[PDB]
Design a protein around this ligand. Structure first.
Ligand SMILES: C[C@H]1CCO[C@@H]1C(=O)Nc1cnns1
Ligand SMILES: C[C@H]1CCO[C@@H]1C(=O)Nc1cnns1
Ligand SMILES: [Cl-]
Ligand SMILES: [Mg+2]
Ligand SMILES: [Mg+2]
Ligand SMILES: [Mg+2]
Ligand SMILES: [Mg+2]
Lengths: 194, 194
């Protein structure tokens, strides 16, 4: 039933644009919507990746490796899965491993890679691949992991035990007052609910 | 260490605006960011999303999801039931109300998250994730009545919780839908648990 009729540019920045979307509703009636898109999407299957990095270490409980960064849109610090945009020509897997190493120091191994999933589909067309990666924390490469953030990138690494993730996130929100990302929180809830 | 200096309006629609944010990077260098905000926020958060756990005896526990055309995406998405919190509504009440409108189910609050970010590199949008159980054996949930608000068109999809990730992959494969990143994240953690 439903489909896009037209997409009219309202305002284009260097990184984000706002569009007026005209579409057909399922009664046969024309309607509009205000849509956000990035200006950076080329032929990638998605804008970005987010990495679920499972740090595995003999005689350690598995940890989820998370990052803490100031996010200007939020006016504050956020706790998130390591993530970044996919470069032109780059694979989601390569972007995930590259971003994980830049943001955390760790060298991971691919486990799985999602289809493109929507970030906030009532608002934007933004999508990511969610890439699950295992980190062998017994490898010497992963012993003293040094973040290599790019220009204007400033990231803190936070590893939390998988078996207590939701309580440990609740403890950081109690004591350091930041925001947890919705995907991180969703993953932690499901670890509890399973 | 980092903080907002100023915000400059770039473009304001009825529902969404685009701002250019000036901020202090942790070197003491001044930097800019293009950020999106909703115009609708009052609230604890812009919105709620509901994790609806449908419990019927002698059946697999299901997660209740919705499929809707999303104009920013140009296609159909599979999502947790969700909407904006009314001015003076609690997150819990917004959850039960949104769940009833989009699915017809009448549910009970299990737990409620703090405000979590949707896409903090792009927007300031936040939600409360609200876990809700639905007693599927109750007469009120026998022939559930979906009450769409104006211009909502929602298909309900219930999927077994114990095979959720495989079921979502199947749907994407067969039906050319986009799964929401929070839904996919929850589904991953169900599999990754122990
Ligand atoms: C918040 C939604 C829920 C349904 O009605 C509202 C709506 O029209 N939002 C729009 C955003 N952009 N253009 S219209
Ligand atoms: C797309 C992001 C992720 C990598 O760095 C990019 C960036 O600087 N974005 C900005 C948005 N507004 N001002 S700068
Ligand atoms: Cl539950
Ligand atoms: Mg990043
Ligand atoms: Mg990066
Ligand atoms: Mg909704
Ligand atoms: Mg609704």
């Amino acid at each position: 039933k439903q489909y896009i009729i037209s997409e009219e540019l309202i305002s284009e920045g260097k990184w984000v644009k706002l569009e007026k979307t005209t579409y057909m509703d399922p009664t046969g009636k024309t309607r509009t919507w205000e849509s956000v898109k990035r200006t950076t999407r080329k032929e990638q299957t998605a804008d970005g990746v987010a990495v679920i990095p499972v740090l595995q270490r003999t005689l350690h409980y598995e940890c989820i490796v998370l990052v803490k960064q100031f996010r200007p849109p939020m006016g504050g610090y956020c706790i998130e899965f390591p993530a970044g945009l996919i470069d032109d020509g780059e694979t989601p897997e390569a972007a995930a491993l590259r971003e994980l190493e830049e943001e955390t120091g760790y060298k991971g191994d691919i486990a799985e890679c999602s289809p493109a999933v929507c970030m906030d589909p009532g608002l934007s067309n933004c999508t990511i691949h969610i890439v699950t990666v295992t980190i062998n924390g017994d490898d010497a490469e992963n012993a003293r992991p040094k973040p290599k953030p790019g220009d204007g990138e400033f990231v803190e690494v936070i590893s939390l035990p998988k078996n207590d993730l939701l309580q440990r996130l609740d403890a950081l929100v109690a004591e350091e007052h930041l925001t947890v990302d919705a995907r991180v929180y969703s993953y932690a809830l499901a670890l509890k609910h399973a």
